[PDB]
Design a protein around this ligand. Structure first.
Ligand SMILES: CC(/C=C/C=C(\C)c1cc(C(C)(C)C)cc(C(C)(C)C)c1)=C\C(=O)O
Lengths: 10, 244
């Protein structure tokens, strides 16, 4: 979930 | 505590206002404008791989806005990160489907796609009329309820904040938040609908929403069989991550 994780924290 | 219920409702309504791909203002300006015959022909002339790529991009765009929607709901961000991820992975497309209804014209059965409204025939190249038909049937049906933006905001948040998703580590915390959301929605509905059963009708559609999204997964799986290279090197990275 690398991308989803990044967006959640963006 | 009624103050908490109102705070939660207002927070969700505000997030919805700020995070739909299409604001009510933009939808109002479009006024159901449809794609021209030339544009429709172009869509029908696209290869299956080409049109799938375009659809994956539009779907990913909408999903990105659902992530933003969740990030602005205070109660959602209070959940452990593991469950935040699970709720988004399992429910982002379901929220997109609910939102799609805002951009659907029930009089001619057209949906907003790449800037203009188009009918199911615009998606012929997908070779998935059943998915299109099921999505359109759901939209037509939800539109018949004539929901307000506040109701769509709250209902979409309940679809996302579902305590029944598999693998959730703290399902009770999700349940408690969803209960508060439904309590708020129950009251909001009183302002716009005579049918005090509207909430019941909405909750009854939950399985249908999941069914449509699972069909999307099924179609994608077959597409991957025929064009594995397209999915791995052409589809949006997030789309691949969520539906592999
Ligand atoms: C405008 C918006 C979301 C729109 C959704 C669209 C265009 C869409 C299109 C299809 C096809 C390509 C098959 C017609 C399928 C689906 C799913 C959800 C059923 C998978 C959604 C969102 C917003 O404004 O926030």
């Amino acid at each position: 979930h690398k991308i989803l994780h990044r967006l959640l924290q963006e | 505590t009624m103050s908490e219920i109102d705070r939660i409702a207002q927070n969700i309504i505000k997030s919805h206002l700020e995070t739909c791909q299409y604001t009510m203002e933009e939808l109002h300006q479009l006024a159901w404008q449809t794609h021209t015959y030339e544009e429709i022909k172009a869509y029908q002339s696209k290869s299956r791989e080409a049109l799938w790529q375009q659809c994956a991009i539009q779907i990913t765009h909408a999903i990105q806005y659902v992530v933003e929607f969740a990030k602005r709901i205070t109660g959602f961000m209070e959940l452990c990160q593991n469950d935040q991820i699970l709720l988004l992975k399992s429910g982002c497309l379901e929220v997109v489907l609910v939102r799609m209804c805002r951009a659907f014209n029930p009089l001619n059965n057209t949906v907003l796609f790449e800037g203009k409204y188009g009918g199911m025939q615009m998606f012929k190249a997908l070779g998935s009329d059943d998915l299109v038909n099921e999505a359109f049937d759901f939209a037509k049906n939800l539109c018949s309820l004539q929901l307000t933006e506040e109701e769509i905001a709250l209902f979409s948040s309940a679809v996302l904040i579902s305590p029944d998703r598999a693998w959730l580590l703290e399902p009770r915390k999700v349940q408690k938040l969803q209960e508060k959301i439904y309590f708020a929605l129950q009251h909001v509905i009183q302002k716009n609908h005579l049918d005090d059963e509207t909430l019941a009708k909405l909750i009854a559609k939950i399985p249908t929403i999941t069914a449509v999204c699972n069909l999307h997964g099924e179609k994608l799986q077959v597409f991957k069989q025929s064009h594995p290279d397209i999915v791995n090197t052409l589809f949006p990275p997030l789309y691949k991550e969520l539906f592999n």
